[PDB]
Amino acid sequence: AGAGAGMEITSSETGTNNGYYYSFWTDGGGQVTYTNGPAGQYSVEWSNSGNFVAGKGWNPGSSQTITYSGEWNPNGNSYLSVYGWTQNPLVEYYIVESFSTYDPSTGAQELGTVETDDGTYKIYQTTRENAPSIEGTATFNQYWSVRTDHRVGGTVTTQNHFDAWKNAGLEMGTHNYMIVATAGYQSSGSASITVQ
Ligand SMILES: O[C@@H]1[C@@H](O)[C@H](O[C@@H]2CO[C@@H](O)[C@H](O)[C@H]2O)OC[C@H]1O
Ligand SMILES: [Zn+2]
Ligand SMILES: [Zn+2]
């Protein structure tokens, strides 16, 4: 955003900015700095981070087709994803467009694949126990769609992923937020992403 960046945010916060929901979450490790830009733009910069997840989108999500653009420059473990939550049942989900040094599906049984938006995604389910959530400390399932050819930018037809997860037997609840998220853990980097 250059100058166009808003005030720097360094602790967890949510809101709506220029018509877009934003969620910034950090566990407090290292330094993580988030800024809202014009329209659907956000930037995040991080240095020896703990866990963080940040981005812009909608709350609630409604399975829309997402177009996003920008750049994503991690040095270490980071994911660029369409990211969100359902409630009842509580579910955290990821449509991973790129990951850097660590595959977040490691150790999970692959449940199938989905072909959409000129790529192929492998489908996984995991579980988090006594973990942070949009409802507080909780246990919940995580659903994953992990693109086989990593990219930064393009179109994500989220309904195709949700349909594929349901066909694989993965139940979704009522939609809470859905954002184009930059995530990191014990890494550094920067990203500047615009949700169109
Ligand atoms: O909205 C926030 C969530 O993004 C946060 O989720 C943690 C995000 O990192 C993931 O690796 C974890 O599985 C997940 O627990 O929880 C807090 C909530 O306010
Ligand atoms: Zn990659
Ligand atoms: Zn490629």
The protein residue with its alpha carbon nearest to ligand 1, atom 16, reads 133
Ligand 1 atom with the smallest distance to the CA of 142 is 13
Task: State the distance from the centre of ligand 3 to the C-alpha of 136, rounded, in angstroms.
Answer: 37
**How far apart are the C-alpha atoms of 106 and 99, rounded to whole Å?**
12
* Ligand nearest to the Cα of 22, by number: 1
Task: Considering the domain delimited by 2-195, tell me its CATH architecture.
Answer: Sandwich (2.60)
The minimum-distance atom of ligand 1 relative to the CA of 14 is 1
Distance 93 CA to ligand 2 centre (A): 19
Residue 66: both structure tokens together:
């997402």
Q: Position of tokens 């037809």? A: 157
Experimental technique of record: X-ray
Ligand number nearest CA of 151 is: 3
